[PDB]
Amino acid sequence: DIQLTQSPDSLAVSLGERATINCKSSQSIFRTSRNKNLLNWYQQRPGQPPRLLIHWASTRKSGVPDRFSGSGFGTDFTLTITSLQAEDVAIYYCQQYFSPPYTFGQGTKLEIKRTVAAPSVFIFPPSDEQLKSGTASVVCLLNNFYPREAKVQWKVDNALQSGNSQESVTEQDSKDSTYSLSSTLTLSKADYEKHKVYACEVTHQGLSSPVTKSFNRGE
Amino acid sequence: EVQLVESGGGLVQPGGSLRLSCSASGFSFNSFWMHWVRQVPGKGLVWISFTNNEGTTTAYADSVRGRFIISRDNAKNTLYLEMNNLRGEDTAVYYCARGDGGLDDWGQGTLVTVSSASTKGPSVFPLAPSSKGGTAALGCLVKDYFPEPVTVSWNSGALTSGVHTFPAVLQSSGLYSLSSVVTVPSSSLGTQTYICNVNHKPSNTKVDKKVEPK
């Protein structure tokens, strides 16, 4: 089996700048009889099927912008993206089409670098309908921030919580290059009803100091 | 055009069988190689199988050889993948692709979940907008379901701007949870109704939840 190794695994490039993604094959994928290197490049945008950019190492598929170009010979290949656009956020894959199995590289995740953007922070108490079920979920939303690094701490009557929350983060937005994040604090109804003050404290580079959003149970 | 539509994915017991279908339109099906590729959620593309134009040459990834069978019905413009003796490692989104210069016209993919766990539909709770702007946030918490996936739309697909549907997280119970949120003009809250449309097809659970300010 032919192994493709991409480098780097992760790449952060500013809007308008140039990305360089390498693909190394464990053996030559130059088909002498065709005078072609049988290397394909794909873009897989968040939540989308893969899109073919390039085949035969350097031939662009019709309708792919000329900002995307493929180069290399034999075992060493490069995808270059010039004038990076917000919609280029994706994982990029190489694939050999020389001999089955038609193996893919492991992918290169491309992050768009943009200006720092503070999160908008929202807190949601548990619904009356859920409380009837014996569980309380408290949600804290961090909306449209950059960069990715964010600290979310839960406090209940000022006691710092650990082990009873989970976070989820969206992929970078294809238009504004931001992330959003949810933190969900899960308590029994009994524990929820024993405390008054529910607080989500957010630390992010875009905030001059941590932001707290809070509510008092039953208001 | 060219359209490939995968179907036949779903929850299946380990050791069981599934047949995936890839329905092709808008081109001469029998003039092109066809591929299956899979993707474990949040992981890379893994080539699985191909067939030449007539189905006289096929090949398979090492991990599926002797368990999976690719075939095509040129008369019905359909590609198939018969999957036998399924394992946890086979859980993935399965894509079909047309062979041209590269793999092209990828379908939307079909999720195959190989598990002995029971189907369970979600509970849907509102994330109500509060008095605190210009911008308001509201949402739906879709809690305690198995397997993936759930779909969430807002106002039957009329509301798309500012929607974030979070990746599902696996809880200590082994059930999934996710939230879907949307930011809207706070000026809309008086008059605009907001309904999240949740569909968990594996359990036949469809819920339309009105999210009302408190």
Author numbering:
A (entry chain LLL): 1 to 219
B (entry chain HHH): 1 to 132, 136 to 217
From the article:
Wall teichoic acids (WTAs) are glycopolymers decorating the surface of Gram-positive bacteria and potential targets for antibody-mediated treatments against Staphylococcus aureus, including methicillin-resistant (MRSA) strains. Through a combination of glycan microarray, synthetic chemistry, crystallography, NMR, and computational studies, we unraveled the molecular and structural details of fully defined synthetic WTA fragments recognized by previously described monoclonal antibodies (mAbs 4461 and 4497). By using an integrated approach that combines microarray, synthetic chemistry, X-ray crystallography, NMR spectroscopy, and computational studies, we showed that S. aureus WTA glycoforms bind the mAbs 4461 and 4497 in a cavity formed between the CDRs of the heavy and light chains. The GlcNAc moiety is a prime recognition element, being inserted in the antibody binding pocket, and the RboP residue to which the GlcNAc is appended and both phosphates interacted with the antibody surface participating in the binding.
Interestingly, our structure showed that, besides the GlcNAc, both phosphate groups and the Rbo-C and Rbo-A units were involved in the interaction with the mAb. The GlcNAc contributed to mAb binding through a stacking interaction with residue W33 from the heavy chain. An extended network of H-bonds further stabilized the sugar ring within the antibody. The minimal ligands used in the previous study contained one ribose moiety and a single phosphate monoester, as opposed to the phosphodiesters present in the naturally occurring WTA and our ligands. We did not see the triangulation of the two arginine residues, which was shown to be crucial for the binding of 4497 with the β-1,4-GlcNAc WTA phosphomonoester, as reported by Fong et al. In particular, stable hydrogen bonds, maintained for more than 90% of the simulation time, were monitored between G99 and the GlcNAc C4-OH and the hydroxyl group of Y97 with the GlcNAc C3-OH. Simultaneous contacts between phosphate group 5 with the guanidinium groups of R31 and R34 were established in the simulation. Overall, our results showed that the binding interactions of mAb 4497 with ligands 2 and 3 are highly concordant, with six principal residues (W33, G99, D100, Y97, S31, and N53) interacting directly with the β-GlcNAc sugar.
